[PDB]
């Protein structure tokens, strides 16, 4: 039994960056959160970053993306660690 | 209907960044390779990042872990995407 279930926060890296002070303020819900990097490489960056945060229960991953008010510039896309 | 199961290799950063070239030798099973990063961030690294990998099936995730001659240094955690 573990069940972790994570979400990718895609968007920009300067706002995932300063995403994290609002993961703050509801972090009885939020657990842990990954270092923003960014799918594959072709050169540098450019504005499409995601993020992996981390739950405890599986009702808290729905929770976090629908109670803490998330920027629209990001996405949350549904995940499942499994580990 | 998706399914898109991925691995976590954790180990190191310069380890990781060669990996790849191993990851195409097996290109039949393997699809995409995300770019090696780390859990969270205190400061700066210190030898452990982990990439997230992508195949096209179950069995083909499965595969790769026991196809592919990974590195010991790293490590497969198995990984579920579901996007």
Redesign the interface.
């Known amino acids: 039994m573990a069940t972790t279930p994570i979400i990718?926060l895609k968007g920009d890296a300067n706002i995932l960056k300063c995403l994290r002070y609002r993961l703050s303020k509801y972090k009885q819900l939020y657990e842990?959160?990954?270092?923003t990097?960014?799918?594959?490489?072709t050169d540098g960056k450019h504005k499409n970053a995601i993020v992996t945060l981390t739950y405890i229960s599986t009702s808290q991953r729905d929770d976090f993306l629908n109670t803490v008010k998330i920027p629209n510039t990001v996405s949350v896309?549904?995940?499942?660690?499994?580990?």
């Not at 549904?78 to 580990?83: D, E, F, L, V």
Request: with cysteine; charged share 0%.
């Open positions: 990718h842990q959160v990954s270092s990097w960014h799918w594959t490489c896309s549904t995940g499942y660690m499994t580990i």
